[PDB]
Amino acid sequence: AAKIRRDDEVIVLTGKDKGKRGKVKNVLSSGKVIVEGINLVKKHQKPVPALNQPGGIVEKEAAIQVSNVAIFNAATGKADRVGFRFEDGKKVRFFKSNSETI
Amino acid sequence: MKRTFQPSVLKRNRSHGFRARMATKNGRQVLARRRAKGRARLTVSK
Amino acid sequence: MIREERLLKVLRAPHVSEKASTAMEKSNTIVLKVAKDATKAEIKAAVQKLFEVEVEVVNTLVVKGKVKRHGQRIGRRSDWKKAYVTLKEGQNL
């Protein structure tokens, strides 16, 4: 299965937001994720009257790699790796290092 | 002056077409080679 | 009957296109993209049943696909059939 997935809260490990937490918006089958308030790129978008868009520079979040994030433990308050155990026939994720099921 | 190619589809098909090609052991080997070569037009037909 | 109700999926789209279509509306008849294997009589039936209108006679023609675009290779469109249908009198749709 997939370790980092859709509605999760995670903390960044590497590059320019290094240490910035945020929630995963979506997760792209390139092996990337879009996480809110983490990577911001100022796209230049033309104003459109039909769509009632003001135009000019807008701010959005680019896709970072899945390996550049790890999910935030919040019981230790640090980054933590994820494993998969079976509980009652459910393949659940669990935090390593305190072994807690998510 | 009158040059060598004087087009005519009836003759074309009758002389080089699929069925004509098919009507002779060697004509068939013609196709076989072209198939093995992976040719996109076995024999320029309709 | 003669044509199964299933096979009266021959009507494929109206060809409301060009004054050709509409100016030949304003003087009887409607025109339509219609199947490919459709048999005039076979397509009259469709227009009787569905559309529930009257139909005097139907003419057909085949449109040939324009081939276009591309650099080295080339792309061609599909052929398709035209309707031109001519309704009897109490003309509606």
Partner: protein
């Protein structure tokens, strides 16, 4: 209380061209308002709305990609909805 004898029509355009949307009502004397997917913009330099009442005609020019929605007109009690998509070059 009137209706829409003639609904709109989905049309395509290559950003820059000009889209067209027509719609006839039943009673003259009125003033509706067109709106993309559902946004009431405002006839400006990129919007050409010319209606004489008894009739309503729209004329959008170089339509952007956003216009990718439907043209739903609104008037008294009538309501139309065509399809419009803005394709790039």
């Amino acid at each position: 209380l009137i209706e829409v004898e003639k609904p709109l029509y989905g049309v395509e355009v290559f950003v820059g061209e000009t889209a067209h949307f027509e719609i006839e009502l039943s009673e003259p004397d009125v003033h509706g308002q067109w709106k993309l997917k559902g946004q009431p913009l405002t006839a400006s330099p990129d919007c050409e709305i010319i209606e004489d009442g008894k009739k309503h005609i729209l004329i959008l020019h170089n339509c952007q990609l956003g216009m990718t929605g439907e043209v739903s007109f609104q008037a008294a009690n009538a309501k139309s909805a065509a399809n419009l998509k803005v394709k790039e070059l």
